[PDB]
Structure formats: structure tokens, C-alpha cells
Amino acid sequence: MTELCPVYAPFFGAIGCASAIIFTSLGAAYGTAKSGVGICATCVLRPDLLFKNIVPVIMAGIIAIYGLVVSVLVCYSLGQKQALYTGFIQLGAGLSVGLSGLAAGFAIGIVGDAGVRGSSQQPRLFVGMILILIFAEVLGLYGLIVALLLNSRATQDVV
Amino acid sequence: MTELCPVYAPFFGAIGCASAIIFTSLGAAYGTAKSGVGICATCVLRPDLLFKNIVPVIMAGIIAIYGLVVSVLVCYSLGQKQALYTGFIQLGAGLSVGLSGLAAGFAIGIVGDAGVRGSSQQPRLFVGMILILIFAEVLGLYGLIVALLLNSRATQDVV
Amino acid sequence: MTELCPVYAPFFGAIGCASAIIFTSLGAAYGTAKSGVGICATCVLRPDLLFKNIVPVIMAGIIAIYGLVVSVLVCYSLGQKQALYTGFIQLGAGLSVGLSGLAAGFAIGIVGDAGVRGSSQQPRLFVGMILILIFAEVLGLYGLIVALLLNSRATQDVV
Amino acid sequence: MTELCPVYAPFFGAIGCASAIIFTSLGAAYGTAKSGVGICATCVLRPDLLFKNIVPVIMAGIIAIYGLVVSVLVCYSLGQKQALYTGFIQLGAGLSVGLSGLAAGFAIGIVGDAGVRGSSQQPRLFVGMILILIFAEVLGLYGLIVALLLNSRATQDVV
Amino acid sequence: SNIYAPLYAPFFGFAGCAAAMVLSCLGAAIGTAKSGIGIAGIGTFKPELIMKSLIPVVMSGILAIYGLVVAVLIAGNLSPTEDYTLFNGFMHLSCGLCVGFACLSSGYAIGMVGDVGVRKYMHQPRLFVGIVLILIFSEVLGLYGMIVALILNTRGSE
Amino acid sequence: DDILSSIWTEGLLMCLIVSALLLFILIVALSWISNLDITYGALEKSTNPIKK
Amino acid sequence: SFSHFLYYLVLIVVIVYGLYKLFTGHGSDINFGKFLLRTSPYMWANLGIALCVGLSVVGAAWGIFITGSSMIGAGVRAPRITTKNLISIIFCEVVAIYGLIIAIVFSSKLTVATAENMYSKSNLYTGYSLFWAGITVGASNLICGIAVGITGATAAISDAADSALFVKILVIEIFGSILGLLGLIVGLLMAGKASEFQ
Amino acid sequence: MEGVYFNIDNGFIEGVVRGYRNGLLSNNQYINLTQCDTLEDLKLQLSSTDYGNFLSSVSSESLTTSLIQEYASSKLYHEFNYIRDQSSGSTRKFMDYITYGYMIDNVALMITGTIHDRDKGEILQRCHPLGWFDTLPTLSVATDLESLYETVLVDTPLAPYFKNCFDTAEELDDMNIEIIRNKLYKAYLEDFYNFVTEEIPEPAKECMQTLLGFEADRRSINIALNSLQSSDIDPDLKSDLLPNIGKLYPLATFHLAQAQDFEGVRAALANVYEYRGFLETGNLEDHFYQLEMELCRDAFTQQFAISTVWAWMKSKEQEVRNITWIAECIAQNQRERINNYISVY
Ligand SMILES: CCCCCCCC/C=C/CCCCCCCC(=O)OC[C@H](COP(=O)(O)OCCN)OC(=O)CCCCCCC/C=C/CCCCCCCC
């Protein structure tokens, strides 16, 4: 309708809101299935380690709560008549948290699968996995921080 | 006839309605096909466990309802004359519940095939398969939430 | 510039000049490579046959000479102001000698490696290997007869 | 601004100056490497033939010097105001030496890695491996001769 | 204003400044990664031979110093007030592709040779100089790419 | 007549390269997921009268 | 195959389309110059900030499972290494921090511009720069992360063999880390003279 | 390249297997066993090794050089099945092919027993446990091969490998069975060569082509020398027993099949340097074992390669063979050849 407020402008918000839960869900599924199969293999002979080895399955569930938090904040900045400045902000936020959580998720699966198998054979090797696995859950966070910095600038001084 | 409301605006809405039931049924189907092979291998020897390992087949089906709900709702938003904005909201809703539910079905399929088998050699493992499947079911619930908050904003404050 | 003689016409010629020497050098290289690998094996135990077995390498090398004399005759017919007719032909001259010699190069290497390993077991096979290579070397000559006729027609009765 | 001399004409010359360094280096890197592996394997048994089997690597460095000559020599011919004819001809000069020197590499690498392994066993094969390499090194020299003729014409009778 | 200086020409200058790092670092990465596999592999048999066999990793590092230089010089000739002609941007694009693919080529040869040599050096210690000589031919390939990329820079401006 | 095109407007092109981008990511993520394979040995019951 | 067939069926449509327009006297219709001018410089600037912190996290997460999956296997017999070999997980995480420092610097340059002065010399300059600088930092830290994981999966296996060898392989693991620090520098030099959108 | 995608599936495997090699004994550790006096002193010393308490359940008189070979081997087999369990995909195929060569041996071993009318229990104890399949003891039923094939061996993965074997006689004896056993390895070592070339990627591809080429060359040499015991065998028959993948193929497998005597064999192996001097001097079987270790020692110089599973087994098998040699010499008090042990680590 205007040079600064076209009608295709919300397309980048809606696609950004969607891609934040799509990319973070995929990650938390790769890391739940992969991890989840080690738990179903060690606890045939060592059932006493079951509740202690669900920790990888937790870390990936947090990756999904981040992508839900960004979809909820960019959704309430949408409108039929919004600027094109605002739309690309809404995009980069979803592309940041999504692409970051997808990657973190896959690492949680590969490392968590190996830890549960090893710690059954070496009980001193549990704490070593809990360390390595926090540096993956924090990469989904570093994508969340970028999404939050950008969203602040969304409707600031817009006209 | 109007710049805000073109003739090609329903094109995105109908794809969004189709896409929500399509990508949840692919995930709901992987989950039954994959975890249905495991059940049929274990219960030739021990069919006393037959009405106890249908749970991955239940949960794969609960995904396919998350899409039927969303598809019905956007179908009642469609119209010959509507804003292009309303068409984008509808597409974002269907993809999110869909591609996030496809992700939930891959996880349920793997963990249910590995879990029913391992539970045939260790009954204490059943209780852990149930947890690992709730963290995967919840990945689809999040996509429904994002879908219904988007649809809520689809027809309000639109000209 | 002109309707018959536009500015972009030398492009197809400059690419028709390189295509002759590019695609012959690739074929002449698939020849020396494979035939070289066969030679360097047989002449471990029978060095006396080394000089006889360099014949496939010479045949592959004459291929690349065909793509040189064509590329030279094309250089001296280029111009800032030439017709498309002169520029299209120069492309068809280069693809013909280029992609024919590529084909003679793969035949020679595959035959030259077979008969040279087998001629150390039987000397009578040598005149038969040669007789098979003449057919494969004459393929590149047919592409040279077609190029040379074209180039002699590219500047004939032209505005 | 003239139709003969657009502002986008130096683009075609730049890609020719760059093509000559890109495809010779990848051809010299393939040959140097593989020749370098066949040398190392033999010299464990027989390290008194080390400074005599470094001849395949030298051949492949003469390939990369063929490509520096042309790039240097067309870059002195580049200009803000020049004609398309000068650009189409500089692209041909680079693709010729480039993709014909890439061919020599894939030959010098295959033959060197074989004749070096075979000369450790029979020393009479060292003068067969050098004939064949001469027939490979000659392929990149033909592409240099074509380039030097094209480059001569690029500024000849041009407005 | 000027037809010889459009306003999209900076697009092609930064494209070369990015191609000089992404492709030169990809060469250094391939040299260190593959060589270190060969150095650590023998390390369970001959630890003494490691502290002399870091020559392949320090040559791979020099490759990344070549692209730094070229990228610095390019960024120095970019500004939003200077009239940046389109000719100059096509040169800066080829300043970057040349040194990039040439250093990507050097890193592939240094890694393949450095791996096999170290694994075979433990058996034979008289092979050392020949390895080093072969690694010098693989390094000058990255020098040829920057002797070209410093001329293009000089002629693009003037 | 300084338009880019009537059909291939700049607004459509910006939206088709972004779709191309998000789809490129998706197609990769579904290649990693398909190659998942279950570790069946630690689930089956195997016993031998030779070793045991 | 199928996926490679499409790569060759795209190349064949781009060629037949280019020659349709050229032979007909319409080769000017395929104009990259207008596309660069008419497209919004906010698009280019918000891709770069996303592809910087995104491609940097891909690399970091990559090296963490090469280094992490070998340590855990090596740690069965030598459980003493998981805290000594921990330094390899630290140089792989830190390239993600570099991609987050950029996005702090570049986010400051995101400002609203008037509609008349949107497609100006300076605001186009500033979109082109934050795009290729983000590509630069992201694609370069992607490479430094995969490399340091390979280096640090070996240093886990060597340390389980013998404690002495761990120190000797760190030197390889330090030089690899330089690659990410150089990329950060080059990006800041690009966007040094870029000014916020007016 | 090598390490970019290997660790997704096989990173944990590679780490455990390279920890299993550090427990391989060194030359200094073989000496400490050599100067032992009894088996009760040989037990105390292996406690210092990675064998540990593999004999804690055992008393003084119960010790024998037979019971030590049993519990040192059984510790290799649990480790193998552990690794094969954690595997998936191509790595699970690769580790099933390794076991198809141990059941071929057990097919030939149950059948020869039936010809001599012995009990299955007395035979099963002599069977290797990695070559077990469900219907193995059912081969004690019949002597006709086509009977054994249809009823039992069709379901097996050995079914493709009996094509060239339907020439047996109505009655079945030792020299006929050995010919069957050698046709199987011919087909097994040719299927597991193409499998590696198609699916297994580099640099493990290059290393397993070599390690499988040595297994082929070693058989082609022994099969020829065993024929010298025989009266006469047609040449075209031996061609169906010798595989077609090693350095010997094609030139030397021709001149080996046509070898009437020991000198005619040396005429065939003289044109290959790798195998040039084995026949000339010393015990032949020791020369192969010393060349197997050297190739496996060189496989561990690599990284991100699944060939270390092959290399690891063959190394620890030879470790077990050295323990038993030292053990026999101690009890029998013969100490002339006690230093015969083969070690490269
Ligand atoms: C054959 C049908 C069956 C198969 C259907 C599958 C999907 C096929 C592809 C659908 C998208 C492409 C067709 C629609 C494009 C045309 C729409 C249109 O007219 O929009 C115009 C309008 C511009 O109008 P003006 O600037 O005024 O110019 C005048 C008009 N030319 O631009 C737009 O609205 C552009 C919108 C394009 C959106 C295309 C992409 C849709 C989303 C698909 C995503 C797929 C990838 C998966 C993403 C995963 C992560 C979330």
C-alpha cells in the first residue's frame, strides 16, 4: 500500500514464527530418538541406571521450549499493516533460534547415546558426559539471545 | 479487486489446510509402521504383552488429530475475498503443526520399536519407554499451540 | 551493433576455439594415463618390450594435435565486427573435433591397456592390438574433416 | 557507454585471468600429491632413489607456471574502457590453459605414482616413465600456445 | 551520476574479501587436520619424532596469512564516500578467487603428503629432506595466487 | 519503464530465495534423520551352548 | 542419479532461457543491477546476522561430538582423561562466542530510514557489507570448528595411550583456533566504515 | 574427508577398540612371563596385565595349558560381541562377514566327525563359538551333501557359496570335504572384497583390500604345497580353489596350479618380491604370522577407519597363541624354543 508498508511484508514473520518451532522440534527429535535407543539397550542388563540416564532426553526437551518462546514473542508483533523493517527482524529471529537448536539437538543425540553406553561400563564416566552435554544445550541458547536483541528493535520508531 | 485483498490470496490458505493433515499423517504413519513391526516380533513368543505395547500406536495416532483440528479451523476462515495477510497466517499454522508432528512420529517410531523388544527381556524398561515417548509427543503439542495463537490473529483487525 | 553483425558474436567463436583444445586434451589424457599404468606393470618383468608398448601413447597424442590446428585456423578468422554465421560455425567446428577426440581417447586407453598386458603373454596379439587402435584413432579424423569443411565455409559469401 | 564498449565488459576478462590460476593449481596439486605418495612408499625400502624420483613433481610445477604467465599477461591488458571483443578473447585464453593444464595433472599423477613404484624393482623403467610424462606435460603447452595467440589479437584492430 | 560507477559495485568488492578467507582457511584446515592424523598415529610408537614433524602444520598456517593480507588491502579500498567504479569491483572479485582456490589447492597437497610421510618416516629416517622438498612445491602454489592478486588490486584503483 | 518485471517483481524474488533457503536447510535435516538405524544386537536374546 | 539429474536439468534451463532472450534482442532483460538496487538493504543485513550466529553454532556443535564421542569411548579404560581433554570442548565452543560478538556490533547498525533516502549510496553500502561480513565470520568458524574436533579426537586417543603425548598435539589444536580469530578481524574491518541506516 | 561423518555412528566404537589395543602385551611383558617357573607364577603375572582376574575362580591343580587357552579366548569373544552389538548399518554387515569364515570351518568339522561316527557333544566343544548358527548340530544327521544343503544350509547366509560344489560323490570322505571347504573361502573372500569396494569408504577400503589380499595369497600357497602330498590332480581343478584378488592373481595363480614340485613353486613366487624368500629359509608358517602383524601394526597408524576391528582381533589371537606356547614349555620343562613368540608391539 505504501513504499514502507507493502502487503507481502507479513510473509517473513509468519514464516519466521513457524520455522522456529519446526527447526527446534526436528533437533529435539533426533536427539531424543538417538539418545533413547541407548537407554533401551543398557537397561536390559543394568535397569538400575534408567532414571539417571534420561538426562540427554531432558536437554533436548529444553531446546524445544526455546523455539516456543520465540514463536510467542514474534507472533504478537504481527499486523496487516506493518513495515518491511519489522518483517525481516521477525525472520532473522526464527532463523537464528531454529538453525542453532537444530545443531545443538543433533549433538545431544550423538554424545548422549555414547555416554549412556559408556557409563554402564565405567560409572566414573557419567559426570564426564554431563559436562560435554551442557556445551550443546548452551548453543541453542546463544541463538535465543540474538532473537531477543533483534525483537526489541522491531516496532521502535516505526512509521 | 483490492490491493490488500487479491484474487490469489486463497491459494496460501488451502495449501495450509492440506499441509496440516498431510505432514502429520506421514509422521503418524511412520510411527505405526515402524513400531508395529516390533510388536509383531515379540508377541509370537509372549502374546501376554499384546495389550500393553499398543501405546506407540496410540501416540502416533494422537499426532494425526493435532492436524485434523487445525485443518478444520482454517477451512472456516476461507473466503473468496479476504486479505493476503490472512492467507499467510493460515500457511504458517499448517506447516508448524505439520512439520513439527512429522518430527514427533519419527521419534515415536524408533523408541517404540526398540522399547517393546527390550521390554521383552526386562519388564522394568517399560516404565522408561513411557517417559521417552512423552518428550516426543509434547513436540507436536507445541506446534498446535503456535497454530492456534496464529489463527486467533487471522481475522481480527483486518480490512 | 548491426542486425547481422552484433557485438556478442565473437563469444561463440572464442568458445569454439577453446573447446577444440580443451576436449582433446582431456581425451589424450585418459589415454596416456591408463596405457601408462599398463606399460609400467608389464615392463617390470620384460623390459625389452618397453619401446614397442609406447605406441598407444603416440596415438592418443596425435588427437591433441587435431584440436590445435583447428584452434589456430579459428584465431585468424575472429573479429570485433563479424557475423553470427561466422560465430556459430566456429562453435560447431570446435565441438566436433573436441568431443570426437574425447571418444577416441577413451577407446585407446581401454584397448591399449588390455592388449599391452596380454602381448607379453603372446606376441602375435601385437599386430591385432594395433589394428584395433587404427579404428579408434580414425574417429578423431572424421571430426577433423567436418571442422575443416565448416571453417572453409564460415567466410564464404558472407556480408 | 558505447554499444561496442559497455561498462560490464571487464567482467569477462577478470574471469579469464582467474580461470588460469584456478584450474592449473588444481591440476598441479593433484599430480604433486599422488606422485608424492608413490615416492614415500618406495623410499622406505630404497631411499637412495629419492632425488631421482622427484621428477614427476617438477613437471607438475611447470604446469602452474604456465598459468601465471597468462594471468599476468592479460592483466596488463585490462582497462576501465575496453571492448567486449577484448573480453571474450581473454576468457578463451584462460579456459584454454586452465582446463588443458588440469588434464596434464590427472595424467602426471597417475603415471608418476606407478612408474615410481615400478622403477624401484626394475631400474630400466626410469626412462619409460619420462617419455610418458613428456607426452603429458605437452598437453598444457599446447593450451599455452593458443592463449598467447588469442591474447595477441585482443588489442589488434579494435575500437 | 557516473555510468562507470554504479552503486551496486561494492557488492562485488566484498564478495572477493570473503572469498579470500573462506577458501584460504579451508586450505589451512585441510592441512592441519590431515597432517595431525599422521602425527598422532605414529605417536604411540615413536614420540621423539613429533617435535620435528610440525613442518606440515606451520606451512598450512602461512596459507591463512596470504588471504588475510589480500582481504585487508581490499577493505582498505572500500568506502561509502569514495567513488568506487565497477571495473574496480570485478578486479577485487578476482583478487579473492585467485588466492582462495590456489591456497585451497596447496592445502590439499600438503595434507596428503604430510600424512603418508610421517607414518613412513618412523621406519626410515633418511627420507626427511625429500618430504620437505615436496612440501615446498605445494606451498609456492599459494604464492602464485597472491603475486597475481596484488597486481589486480594495484590496477583496479590505478 | 524502469520496472524489473511485471511477473518477476523484486518482492516475489526476495520471497522465493528465502523459501529456497529454508527448504535447503529442511532437506538436509531430513537426510540426517533418515539415516538413523537401530542397534538391534543389544536388544535380542542370544545364547550359545559352545561358549556359555 | 535423481538428485544429480536435477542439477543438470537446471543448468539446461538457465542456458536455453539465456539464449532465447539473447537471440531475440532481449538480453538486457536479465539485469542483475536492478535486482541489487531495488531489493531492500534490510534483507541483506538480517540474513548476515543470522547466517553468522547460525553457521558458527553448526561448526561448534559439530566438533563437540567428534571430540565428545571419542573421549567417552577412550574414557572407559582411561577415565582420568575427561577433565584433561576438556580443553578441546572449550576451543570448539568459543567460535560460537565470536559469532555472538558480531551480532552485538551489527545489531547497533539496524536503524529505520526515511522512505526517500532508503535506496541511497550509503544504505546500500551498509547492507552489502553486513551480508558478506556475516558470511565471512560464519563460514570461516564453521571450518575452524570441524577442524578442531578432528584434532581433538586424536588428542583424546593419544592421551589414553600415554599422558605425555597430550601436550604435543595441543600445538596443532592452537593453530587451528587462529582461523576463527582472523575471521572476526576481517569482518570488523569490512563493517568499520559502514554507517547506521539514515 | 575422513573424520567429518565417521563419528556419527562409529565414534564410540573406535575409542573402545583403540583402548583394547593398549592392553596388548609388549616385548618386556613377554619376557617377565618367560622367566616364570610354574603356572601359578604365570597367573600372578598376568594379573598385572589387562587380563586381570580372568582366573580368580580357579585353584592350583585345576590349572592347565588347556584351561588357559579357553579363558583367554572367551575374553576376546565377549569383547567382540559387545562391539558387534553397539554397531549398526554397514558396520554391522562388516562384522557379520568376519564370522562367516569361522562357521565354514565348523561345517567342515561336524561333517568329518560323522564320517568317523562321533558324538556331537564331543565335537561341539571343539567348535569355534563365533561360527555358531542355530542349525549347526543338525549337520550330524546326513552324509549326502544335497541332503545337508536343502534341509539346513539354504536358510543360512552360506547358500550363495555352494554353486561350484555340486560335484561331490554319493559317499563323502575327508579329501572331498577339504575340497568343499576351499571352494567356500574362494567365494567368501571374493564377496567380501566387492562389499568393501562398494560400501566401505576410504582409507579403510585401501587397507582391507590389502589385508584380504594376504589371506588369499596365504591360502593359494598352502593349497599348492598340500597337493604335493597327493598323487596327481588336474590343473583346471585347482583353478577352482584359488581365489582371484591378491597380488598373485592372474600371472602366478596360473604357474602355481601347474606346479608339480617344490622347485616349480619357487619359479612362480620368484617374480613377486613380497613373498620372495619365505620358502627359501626358515619355517613357513612363522613368516606369514610375522607379516600379518606388520600389516596390522600399520592399520593402527590410521584414524577414522573401521579396519581396526579386523586388525585388533588378529593381533589378540596371536597374543593368545603365544601365551599357550609359553605355557606348554613351562609345564613340560622344555625351554629351547620358549622365545619363539611373535611380537611387533
Ligand atoms: C501446482 C500446485 C500444487 C503444489 C503446491 C505446492 C507449493 C508450490 C509453490 C507455491 C509458491 C509459489 C506460487 C505462488 C507465487 C505467486 C504469489 C503471488 O502472486 O504473490 C505476489 C506477491 C507480490 O505482488 P506484487 O509485488 O504486487 O507483484 C504483482 C504480482 N506478481 O508476492 C508474494 O505474495 C510472494 C509470496 C511467495 C511465497 C512463496 C513461498 C510459500 C511458502 C513455501 C515454503 C516452502 C519451503 C518450506 C519452508 C520450511 C520452513 C518454514
Curated annotation (Swiss-Prot), chains A, B, C, D:
Proton-conducting pore forming subunit of the V0 complex of vacuolar(H+)-ATPase (V-ATPase), a multisubunit enzyme composed of a peripheral complex (V1) that hydrolyzes ATP and a membrane integral complex (V0) that translocates protons. V-ATPase is responsible for acidifying and maintaining the pH of intracellular compartments. Keywords: Hydrogen ion transport, Ion transport, Membrane, Transmembrane, Transmembrane helix, Transport, Vacuole. Residues 32-53, 113-124 are cytoplasmic. Belongs to the V-ATPase proteolipid subunit family. One of its GO terms (molecular function) is proton transmembrane transporter activity. CDD domains: ATP-synt_Vo_c_ATP6C_rpt1, ATP-synt_Vo_c_ATP6C_rpt2. This is V-type proton ATPase subunit c. The record marks 137 as: Essential for proton translocation. It is a multi-pass membrane protein. GO terms for biological process: endocytosis; endosomal lumen acidification; Golgi lumen acidification; intracellular copper ion homeostasis; intracellular iron ion homeostasis; protein targeting to vacuole; proton transmembrane transport; vacuolar acidification. Pfam families: ATP-synt_C. Present with 8450 molecules/cell in log phase SD medium.
Swiss-Prot record, chain E:
Changing residue 139 to D: Partial inactivation. The record marks 139 as: Essential for proton translocation. GO terms for cellular component: cell periphery; fungal-type vacuole; fungal-type vacuole membrane; Golgi membrane; membrane; proton-transporting V-type ATPase complex; vacuolar proton-transporting V-type ATPase complex; vacuolar proton-transporting V-type ATPase, V0 domain. Residues 32-53, 115-126 are cytoplasmic. One of its GO terms (biological process) is Golgi lumen acidification. Keywords: Hydrogen ion transport, Ion transport, Membrane, Transmembrane, Transmembrane helix, Transport, Vacuole. GO terms for molecular function: proton-transporting ATPase activity, rotational mechanism. The keyword Transmembrane helix applies. InterPro entries: ATPase_proteolipid_c-like_dom, ATPase_proteolipid_csu, ATPase_proteolipid_su_C_euk, F/V-ATP_Csub_sf. V-ATPase is a heteromultimeric enzyme composed of a peripheral catalytic V1 complex (components A to H) attached to an integral membrane V0 proton pore complex (components: a, c, c', c'', d, e, f and VOA1). The decameric c-ring forms the proton-conducting pore, and is composed of eight proteolipid subunits c, one subunit c' and one subunit c''. Present with 538 molecules/cell in log phase SD medium. Belongs to the V-ATPase proteolipid subunit family. This is V-type proton ATPase subunit c'. The gene is VMA11.
UniProtKB/Swiss-Prot annotation, chain G:
Gene3D superfamilies: lithium bound rotor ring of v- atpase. It is a multi-pass membrane protein. It holds the Pfam family ATP-synt_C. InterPro entries: ATPase_proteolipid_c-like_dom, ATPase_proteolipid_csu, F/V-ATP_Csub_sf. The gene is VMA16. One of its GO terms (biological process) is proton transmembrane transport. The lineage of its organism: Eukaryota, Fungi, Dikarya, Ascomycota, Saccharomycotina. This is V-type proton ATPase subunit c''. It comes from the Eukaryota. The record marks 93 as: Essential for proton translocation. GO terms for molecular function: P-type proton-exporting transporter activity; proton-transporting ATPase activity, rotational mechanism.
UniProtKB/Swiss-Prot annotation, chain H:
GO terms for molecular function: proton-transporting ATPase activity, rotational mechanism. Keywords: Acetylation, Hydrogen ion transport, Ion transport, Membrane, Transport, Vacuole. One of its GO terms (cellular component) is vacuolar proton-transporting V-type ATPase, V0 domain. Its main location: membrane. It is a peripheral membrane protein. InterPro entries: ATPase_csu/dsu_sf, ATPase_V0-cplx_csu/dsu, ATPase_V0-cplx_dsu, V-type_ATPase_csu/dsu, V-type_ATPase_csu/dsu_dom_3. It is found in: Vacuole membrane. The modification N-acetylmethionine is found at residue 1. It comes from the Eukaryota. GO terms for biological process: endosomal lumen acidification; Golgi lumen acidification; proton transmembrane transport; vacuolar acidification; vacuolar transport. Present with 1630 molecules/cell in log phase SD medium. Subunit of the V0 complex of vacuolar(H+)-ATPase (V-ATPase), a multisubunit enzyme composed of a peripheral complex (V1) that hydrolyzes ATP and a membrane integral complex (V0) that translocates protons. V-ATPase is responsible for acidifying and maintaining the pH of intracellular compartments. This subunit is a non-integral membrane component of the membrane pore domain and is required for proper assembly of the V0 sector. Might be involved in the regulated assembly of V1 subunits onto the membrane sector or alternatively may prevent the passage of protons through V0 pores. Belongs to the V-ATPase V0D/AC39 subunit family. This is V-type proton ATPase subunit d.
